[PDB]
Amino acid sequence: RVLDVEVYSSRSKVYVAVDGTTVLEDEAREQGRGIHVIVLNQATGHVMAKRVFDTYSPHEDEAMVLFLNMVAPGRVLICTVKDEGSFHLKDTAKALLRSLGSQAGPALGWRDTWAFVGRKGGPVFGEKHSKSPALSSWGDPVLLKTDVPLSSAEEAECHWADTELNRRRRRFCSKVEGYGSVCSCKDPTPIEFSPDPLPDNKVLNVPVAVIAGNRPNYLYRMLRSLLSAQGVSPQMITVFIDGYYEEPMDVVALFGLRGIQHTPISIKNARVSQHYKASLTATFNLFPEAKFAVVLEEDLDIAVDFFSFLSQSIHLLEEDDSLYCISAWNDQGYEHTAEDPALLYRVETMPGLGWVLRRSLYKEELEPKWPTPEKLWDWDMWMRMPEQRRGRECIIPDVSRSYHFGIKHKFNTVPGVQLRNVDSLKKEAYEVEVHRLLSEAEVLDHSKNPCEDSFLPDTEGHTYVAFIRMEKDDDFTTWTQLAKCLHIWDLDVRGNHRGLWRLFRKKNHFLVVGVPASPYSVKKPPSVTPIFLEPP
């Protein structure tokens, strides 16, 4: 058979139509702006992808050239511009549009209305161009009646060997486009992974909760990092999606993981908060013998040794009840302030971004008092308030084991790292080592400037101390200002332990103590006057 595709380019609206039923409209007044790309398979005409690219605005043309390159060849692409798409098209995008046999596309100019439907890899089916006769005038709205030959059920599909990876590959690859080489006949990229097994692994039977929304592109990247991490048990992973969006679920099914959907109790940050609640209770219901639960969000890269790092450290959670969590994320650990991968800290905060929650804490304290949907509080800020944290601390590594790729942070690439002196992070033993470190550490010149490298001797390996004005345990004026000029996280006050911040400057360990609030002011010579910085 053959498909009557109807595409339409206009000033304020834009639509497509596949055998009588239009699968995308957009008469909205301020939005949708740029080229709209819709993608429908070549043997049934089902939509596999829907896109918008603001090439009226800079650099979205680069998003489009990428995406069209990720679309499998043979595939009928339809384009239909509205409002304006010329302004930042650039030679590269016009070149790709030429490649797909479009000639009115590469010559697209100011506020033109242009519609193109055609096959990727030839040939062209219908192109329709409209020229803006004046610069305030626009291309007369265009409508393009093309009939599009339907291919065999066999020529649209990729004939791989019948491995059931490739069975789930085909169920994904025939449903959504834009994921590229995972859906390409030749050189098909892997859909399961061969992570080196971690021996002595204590995190075997800890569930992994993946908190995801309608960002399938992020979640695909996330899961590939995760299922590649040393010692993963995909059995224990379940991806909680907040909504009934099918594309994020198809990515879950592509890797063959367990996917839970949740009806969005809204609004805003309350809505995220309720998804976290729902997902957490759900994880402990799917795994009632589970003492802990790993919580990862979909916008995170998972370091190679992430489960190596948890297995070594998780005994601390049950042996030390003054611990709130274990986190993979050092707020202060950027590439220039973090160095030791074997090293661990205690901090009086709850960083999130890949963390371990203990079952007892959740069902005995947190879940009963979890904020109602009426209140628009961030879940993590609420978990960091003293009624929830109750003065407990979180284990973090100096080099993080998660990377946040949403929308310069140091991230561990070395695998199978042996953490040093793990048991020295129980409450009292950590205090032993802290004092130990201040007794061996060389005090600095506190009349020299702390914001420049001049502050630290030109050396590597030594450990140093600086003292800053912290009048109360609530006075972070000087530290916030300090934080800014070393170019690390500055907004809120993170990584403090009894008034002590641990960081690295110029490959040397570097200790900041707030005087007099911190109980470590005892280590400060009377000669030294505590450093103080004011803001504006």
Curated annotation (Swiss-Prot):
Residues 204-535 are annotated as: Catalytic. Residues 377-385, 489-494 are annotated as: Interaction with O-glycosylated substrate glycoprotein. Its cofactor is Mn(2+). One of its GO terms (cellular component) is membrane. Its EC number is 2.4.1.-. Mn(2+) binds at D299, H404. GO terms for molecular function: acetylglucosaminyltransferase activity; beta-1,3-galactosyl-O-glycosyl-glycoprotein beta-1,3-N-acetylglucosaminyltransferase activity; carbohydrate binding; manganese ion binding. Constitutively expressed. An additional weaker band is also detected in spinal cord, lymph node, and trachea. Expressed especially in astrocytes. Also expressed in immature and mature neurons. Changing W489A: Abolishes enzyme activity. Changing E60K: In RP76; reduced acetylglucosaminyltransferase activity. UDP-N-acetyl-alpha-D-glucosamine binds at I211, A212, G213, N214, R215, D242, H275, E298, D299. Pathway: Protein modification; protein glycosylation. It is linked to Muscular dystrophy-dystroglycanopathy congenital with brain and eye anomalies A3: An autosomal recessive disorder characterized by congenital muscular dystrophy, ocular abnormalities, cobblestone lissencephaly, and cerebellar and pontine hypoplasia. Patients present severe congenital myopia, congenital glaucoma, pallor of the optic disks, retinal hypoplasia, intellectual disability, hydrocephalus, abnormal electroencephalograms, generalized muscle weakness and myoclonic jerks. Included diseases are the more severe Walker-Warburg syndrome and the slightly less severe muscle-eye-brain disease. Belongs to the glycosyltransferase 13 family. This is Protein O-linked-mannose beta-1,2-N-acetylglucosaminyltransferase 1. The chain holds residues 97 to 647 of 660 of the full protein.
